[PDB]
Design a protein around this ligand. Structure first.
Ligand SMILES: [Zn+2]
Length: 421
C-alpha cells in the first residue's frame, strides 16, 4: 500500500525496512538487499535468478523456441542506479494503485491475507509453512525467519514475462485450498506493451487506430489481483481453460485462455462463465474455508516462539471473516463468504481498475500486443500517481495522448515488434 518513506537503493540496511534476505529455495542463494515498502510486502530490485532453480542465469533460450512476445537484455537491473530507479518505479505504482478506492481495498485485502499456518502433520497443532517466510539478517548478523505475503521482484531472462508465482508445500495446493501462500511477482516498471485502439468519433474510419501503450499501473494491479486470489487460496486450477474463436469448428480452435486469467481480466469477457460454474467454485471454496474454521476450532498448540495461538486464531478470523460465538468457536458465514468472494473475484478485476484510473487499455485480455517500449515513470514530468502518462494541464491530458506512442513519442522507446506469431 502507501509507502511511508521514499526509499533510496543506497540507503544502508537498518533491519527495520531495509535488510539483507534470502528466499526459501533449493539453490545456494546469496543474500540480497531488499526493501519492506509496507507491512507484509517487500521489493527486491534484482533480476529473479533465485525463485526458479532452472533459471539461475539470464541466458535467453534458443532463437527458435523464443516466443514472439518476448525480450532479452542481461544489462537490465545490473547497476545500482537502475535498481534505485526500479525501486522508485514500483513504489510509485503502488501509490498510484493505492490512490484509488479500489486499489486501497485490494492492498488491504492483500496485507491481511496471511498464508494459513497449516504446516504440521499434527492436526491440532498450528505451524507456519517455511516457504511463506524469508530469512532476514538481523542487525547483529544472524538470520531470522520472517513472514510476508508479497514480494515484488524483477524479471528473469525474459524481461517482459510478468507473473505471480509461489512455492508449493507438498500434497496441498496452497493457492486453491483456502490456505494461501506468499506470492512472488516478477514485474518491471521500466517497460510496457503497445496495443492498437480506434478512438474514431465519426461514421467511417480514416486516420485509423492509434498506437497506445498500457499504463504500467494496470499491469501491476492485474498481477496483484492474481496475488489476492492466491493468498486466499481461491485461485482457479490452471487446467480450467476456455476456448475462443470466430469460426471455431471443433476440438481446440484459436488460442486458449484460463479461467483464472479471464476472471482476473473481468469485463464483458468474464461473463463467459455460467453462473453455475461460478457457483460451483464458490461452494467448493466455501467448504475449504469451513475446513479452515474447523482446524482452528480443534487447534490446541502452536509451533514457533513468535505468536500465541489466540493471536493467530484472531489473525485468521479477520482474514477469512469467520463468525465466532460466545464460547469462541469459529464458523463460516455463508453470506459473508459470498461478499468477500465477490470482492476478490468480481470487484478486483483489471477492467474495474482501468475504470478507476480513467486510462486507455486493451478491450479484451485476448487483445494481442503489438510491441514493447522502454519507459521512465520516476520523473514527475513523465508520469504521476494521479494521471499516469496523461498529465493534466498539458496536451497529454487529452484523448489519452499521454499513452499515444506517436504523440508522446519522447516517453516511449520501441525495442522489438512481435512479428512472427
Ligand atoms: Zn494474468
Amino acid at each position: 500500500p502507501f509507502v511511508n518513506k521514499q526509499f533510496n537503493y543506497k540507503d544502508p540496511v537498518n533491519g527495520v525496512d531495509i535488510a539483507y534476505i534470502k528466499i526459501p529455495n533449493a539453490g545456494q542463494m546469496q543474500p540480497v538487499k531488499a526493501f519492506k515498502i509496507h507491512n507484509k510486502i517487500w521489493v527486491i530490485p534484482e533480476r529473479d535468478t533465485f525463485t526458479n532453480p532452472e533459471e539461475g542465469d539470464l541466458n535467453p533460450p534458443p532463437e527458435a523456441k523464443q516466443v514472439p512476445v518476448s525480450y532479452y537484455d542481461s544489462t537490465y537491473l545490473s547497476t545500482d542506479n537502475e535498481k534505485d530507479n526500479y525501486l522508485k518505479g514500483v513504489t510509485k505504482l503502488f501509490e498510484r494503485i493505492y490512490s484509488t478506492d479500489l486499489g486501497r481495498m485490494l492492498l488491504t485485502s492483500i496485507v491481511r491475507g496471511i498464508p494459513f499456518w497449516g504446516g504440521s502433520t499434527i492436526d491440532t497443532e498450528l505451524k507456519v509453512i517455511d516457504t511463506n517466510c524469508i530469512n532476514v539478517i538481523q542487525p547483529d548478523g544472524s538470520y531470522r525467519s520472517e513472514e510476508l505475503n508479497l514480494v515484488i521482484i524483477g524479471p528473469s531472462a525474459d524481461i517482459i514475462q510478468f507473473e505471480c508465482k509461489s512455492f508449493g508445500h507438498e500434497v496441498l495446493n496452497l493457492t486453491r485450498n483456502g490456505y494461501g501462500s506468499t506470492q512472488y511477482i516478477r514485474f518491471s516498471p521500466d517497460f510496457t506493451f503497445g496495443f492498437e485502439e480506434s478512438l474514431e468519433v465519426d461514421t467511417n474510419p480514416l486516420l485509423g487506430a492509434g498506437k497506445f501503450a498500457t499504463d504500467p499501473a494496470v499491469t501491476l494491479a492485474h498481477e496483484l489481483i492474481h496475488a489476492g486470489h492466491r493468498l486466499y487460496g481461491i485461485a482457479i486450477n490452471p487446467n480450467r481453460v476456455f476456448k475462443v474463436n470466430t469460426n471455431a469448428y471443433y476440438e481446440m480452435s484459436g488460442l486458449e485462455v484460463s479461467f483464472e486469467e479471464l476472471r482476473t481480466f473481468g469485463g464483458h469477457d468474464a461473463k463467459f462463465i455460467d453462473s453455475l460454474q461460478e457457483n460451483e467454485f464458490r461452494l467448493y471454496y466455501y467448504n475449504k474455508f469451513k475446513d479452515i474454521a474447523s482446524t482452528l476450532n480443534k487447534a490446541k498448540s502452536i509451533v514457533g516462539t513468535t505468536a500465541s495461538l489466540q493471536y493467530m486464531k484472531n489473525v485468521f478470523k479477520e482474514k477469512y471473516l469467520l463468525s465466532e460465538d460466545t464460547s469462541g468457536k469459529f464458523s463460516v458465514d455463508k453470506l459473508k463468504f459470498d461478499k468477500l468472494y465477490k470482492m476478490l473475484t468480481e470487484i478486483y478485476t483489471e477492467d474495474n481498475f482501468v475504470k478507476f484510473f480513467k486510462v486507455l487499455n486493451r478491450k479484451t485480455y485476448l487483445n494481442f500486443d503489438k510491441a514493447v517500449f522502454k519507459i521512465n515513470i520516476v520523473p514527475k514530468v513523465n508520469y504521476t500517481i494521479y494521471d499516469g502518462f496523461n498529465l493534466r494541464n498539458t496536451n497529454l491530458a487529452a484523448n489519452f495522448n499521454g499513452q499515444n506512442t506517436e504523440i508522446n513519442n519522447m516517453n516511449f522507446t520501441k525495442l522489438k515488434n512481435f512479428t512472427p506469431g
